[PDB]
Design a binder for this molecule. Structure first.
Ligand code: RW3
Length: 822
């Protein structure tokens, strides 16, 4: 039983648990038993949750950031239903109280014992909120549709829960012996080394003597470092680069100078190096696992006797404003002297003080830390900055995590991609970020879901495979049931991979109709119908994927041959008609990031009362160049529509009418007006988002429209101006915005306003994007690695300007776009 589970975990995470044992590594072992313990208690806590509290755990509320409506309501075990008319202002309780009246009359004769499930989804309506505040009711209003709900009794929710149970002495300089290696090249080889605390060096780098390429290299030399051993900060990182010269880089490697138990390191180490793209401070501090083939350096840390880092108990014993909103060396010195008044009267400037503190002198670090221990808790915004690699100290990190606990679950979810990436910066396996993510994920099943997937999707990256593998193991121990739910997902993804391979093979040797019918036969096999059916969507756990409609599935006959998979569900009706796209061969990470950023804009816009009718569709990497994109139904590409085919509702006398004609046929009579407004709002949002993000090569192939008028972007797949990208107005959208008239300055200028509001609201949260992109640097995305990428956002949001200033600047950009539009 505990052997079945171990095997289930092994299959789910894509790494066998026996591989953890074989490392005979006490840090891995200690991480495992402690994190198992932590996760088991969390699971125990959850099995006694109240029924409302469980709903909160398993089906967290989906909310928006007088008027009448129709609702259909039924009860759990009957098909008979009642249609009521209520107010968009009424709470779920009144509707429930209403539904119980109708039952008592029909069956010839307490609302608070129920919750309302959205039919055929894992989504529930409860709490003291007006119906219009629930994403679902809210969404229903905009599309016309009647909300459909089931009354579920508390006794039934509890049955769900139950079924789901489980020191300063050493004054001599620091130094190492560089012994030998075993490697491949073409000329002479040099080892260069630096001591780092984040990006900042703790002293100058020191180089090797030249030795010939023939090697199996030999050195037997002492590299001495210009810094007292008693000064090495807790998080001292020692870094190596091996290269050749008569410059040609070969490999690099890093390690911490203290182990995970705070002990200084001795004596001999063998470092298995990673291939190079010279010093790489940000690289992992674990050696290359491919030890058969990896070049290796042998070194020797010299025993100065054990020696540990001193307990905090010991450590605790031991024109300003005009600048405070990069600084000269005299400005630095001023801040440091003011550290106390910084604490008392500028607590939000912590980050700036941390960057001036001298991490290569131990006495100053004791100073800074002592101030940190009484430092007031900081705003989330400020805390997200502190998580950056320019703050490696474990005390700083703990303060940051401590400031971050006041994150709501909706916020945490919004920034989960970045917090996971920042695991790649960590020095050690057991850390505060890991416990934090595990804890919040075990308290919220939606967080759990995406945490799992963000980690699972990277298991083929050797630098994170062990770390990420271990976290998912701990997660599973805390939720046996959710483990199985995710296995169902992994098995579906495994079959889709097999199905996509067949399509790639078949389609090269036969015509599209022929392969299509083959795909269907392949899907109609028992093993497939079953593996592909009855799962939660990896794109959204509240979306249930029930019956694959084989007949509606296809593939696109191009490059990587992505698959199109439709689902239906009687229980959910029209709402359970949903689709996924499976893509294998392409990397989806950049698109996911882009889409999260756009969805962030939408939330920020909505919090100022601006709704730009965005389309934040699912996009999720699940494996090695593998993931999923959510089908947005009732949509088509601008290119396709602009083919202006005859025999169609939308056939134009002039190609420029095509897109308007299409909208007309989808939205007759008085419906046309709202579709044009939907188009205008959505167009403004994507124009501003693409501009702020530096995304170009937009064209009719990678823009789409919904039948409601909503325009949205797909397949980005470059950003931050690396292809300065101009603002873009396509004449074809301008034509539609203008209701089909040559001149319509009343409509075009309401459009300009939309853009100007959207843009000015983002500037107010400019720092949030900057902090978020800074952390994303951890992802290893080629287009998001250096500072010229961050600078791109600095320039697009004109953060160093006044709002009047930037708004004029933006107005020049917009007018330039208008001229470019024919
Ligand atoms: C790296 C990368 O590819 N990123 C990508 N991101 C996206 C995002 C969206 C889409 C996408 N593309 N399309 C058009 C489309 C894509 C198909 C993909 C695989 C198989 C069949 C496909 N058919 C598509 N159409 C074209 C329009 N037609 C009316 C319906 C079917 C979408 N339709 C609805 N929802 C979507 N989300 C899409 C594709 C991609 S690819």
């Amino acid at each position: 039983v505990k052997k079945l589970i171990n095997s289930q975990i092994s299959l789910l995470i894509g790494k066998g648990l026996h591989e953890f044992d074989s490392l005979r590594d006490p840090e891995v072992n200690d991480f495992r038993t402690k994190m198992r313990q932590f996760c088991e208690e969390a699971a125990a806590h959850r099995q006694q949750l109240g029924w409302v509290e469980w709903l909160q755990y398993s089906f967290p509320l989906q909310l928006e950031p007088n008027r009448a409506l129709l609702v259909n309501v039924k009860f759990e075990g009957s098909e008979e239903s009642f249609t009521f008319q209520v107010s968009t202002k009424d709470m779920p309780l009144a509707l429930m109280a209403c539904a119980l009246r109708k039952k008592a009359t029909v069956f010839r004769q307490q609302p608070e014992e129920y919750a309302l499930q959205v039919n055929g989804r894992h989504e529930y309506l409860y709490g003291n909120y007006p119906l219009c505040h629930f994403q679902y009711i809210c969404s229903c209003l905009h599309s016309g549709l009647t909300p459909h709900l089931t009354m579920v009794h508390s006794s039934s929710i509890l049955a769900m829960r139950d079924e789901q149970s489980n020191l300063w002495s050493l004054e001599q300089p620091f130094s190492i012996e560089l012994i030998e290696g075993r490697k491949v090249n073409a000329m002479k080889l040099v080892v260069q080394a630096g001591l780092f605390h984040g990006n900042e060096m703790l002293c100058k780098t020191v180089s090797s003597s030249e030795v010939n390429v023939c090697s199996e290299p030999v050195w037997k030399q002492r590299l001495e470092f210009d810094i007292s051993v008693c000064d090495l900060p807790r998080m001292a990182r020692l870094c190596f680069a091996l290269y050749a010269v008569v410059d040609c880089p070969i490999a690099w490697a890093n390690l911490m100078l203290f182990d995970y138990k705070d002990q200084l390191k001795t004596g001999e180490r063998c470092l298995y190096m990673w291939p190079s793209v010279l010093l790489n401070p940000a690289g992992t501090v674990r050696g290359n696992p491919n030890t058969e083939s990896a070049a290796a350096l042998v070194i020797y840390l010299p025993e100065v006797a054990p020696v540990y880092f001193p307990a905090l108990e010991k450590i605790l014993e031991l024109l300003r404003e005009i600048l405070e909103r990069e600084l000269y060396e005299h400005e630095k010195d001023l801040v440091w002297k003011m550290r106390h008044e910084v604490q008392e009267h500028f607590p939000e400037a912590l980050a700036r003080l941390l960057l001036v503190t001298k991490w290569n002198k131990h006495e100053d670090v004791a100073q800074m830390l002592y101030l940190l221990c009484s430092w007031p808790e900081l705003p989330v915004l400020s805390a997200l900055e502190l998580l950056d690699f320019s703050f490696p100290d474990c005390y700083v990190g703990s303060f940051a995590i401590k400031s971050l606990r006041k994150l709501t679950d909706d916020e945490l979810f919004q920034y989960l991609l970045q917090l996971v990436q920042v695991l790649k910066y960590e020095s050690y396996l057991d850390c505060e970020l890991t416990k934090f993510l595990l804890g919040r994920a075990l308290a919220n099943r939606k967080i759990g879901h995406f945490l799992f997937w963000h980690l699972r999707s990277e298991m083929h990256v050797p630098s994170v495979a062990l770390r990420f593998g271990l976290i998912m193991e701990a997660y599973c121990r805390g939720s046996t049931h959710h483990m199985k739910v995710l296995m169902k997902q992994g098995e579906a993804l495994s079959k889709l991979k097999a199905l996509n391979d067949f399509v790639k093979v078949s389609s090269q040797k036969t015509t599209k109709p022929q392969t299509k019918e083959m795909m269907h036969m392949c899907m109609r096999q028992e093993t497939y119908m079953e593996a592909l059916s009855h799962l939660q969507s990896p794109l959204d756990p509240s979306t249930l994927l029930e019956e694959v409609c084989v007949e509606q599935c296809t593939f696109m006959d191009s490059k990587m041959k992505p698959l199109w998979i439709m689902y239906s569900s009687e229980e959910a009706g029209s709402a359970g008609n949903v689709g996924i796209i499976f893509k294998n061969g392409d990397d989806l990470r950049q698109d996911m990031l882009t889409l999260q950023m756009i969805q962030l804009m939408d939330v920020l816009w909505k919090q100022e009362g601006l709704d730009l009718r965005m389309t934040p569709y699912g996009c999720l990497p699940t494996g090695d160049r593998t993931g999923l994109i959510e089908v947005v139904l009732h949509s088509d590409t601008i290119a396709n529509i602009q083919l202006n085919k005859s025999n169609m509702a939308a056939t134009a006398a002039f190609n420029k009418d095509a897109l308007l004609n299409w909208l007309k046929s989808k939205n007759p009579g008085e419906a046309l007006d709202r579709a044009i407004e939907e188009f205008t709002l959505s167009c403004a949002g994507y124009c501003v988002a693409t501009y702020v993000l530096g995304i170009g090569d937009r064209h009719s192939d990678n823009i789409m429209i919904r039948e409601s008028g909503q325009l949205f972007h797909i397949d980005f797949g470059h950003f931050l101006g690396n292809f300065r990208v101009p603002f873009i107005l396509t004449y074809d959208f301008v034509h539609v915005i203008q209701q089909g008239k040559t001149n319509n300055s009343e409509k075009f200028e309401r459009f300009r306003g939309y853009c100007e509001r959207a843009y000015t609201i983002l500037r107010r949260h400019g720092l949030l994007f900057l902090h978020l992109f800074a952390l994303m640097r951890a992802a290893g995305l080629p287009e998001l690695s250096c500072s010229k990428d961050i600078q791109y956002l600095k320039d697009s949001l004109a953060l160093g300007k006044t709002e009047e200033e930037a708004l004029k600047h933006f107005r020049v950009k917009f007018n330039e776009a208008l001229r470019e539009s024919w």
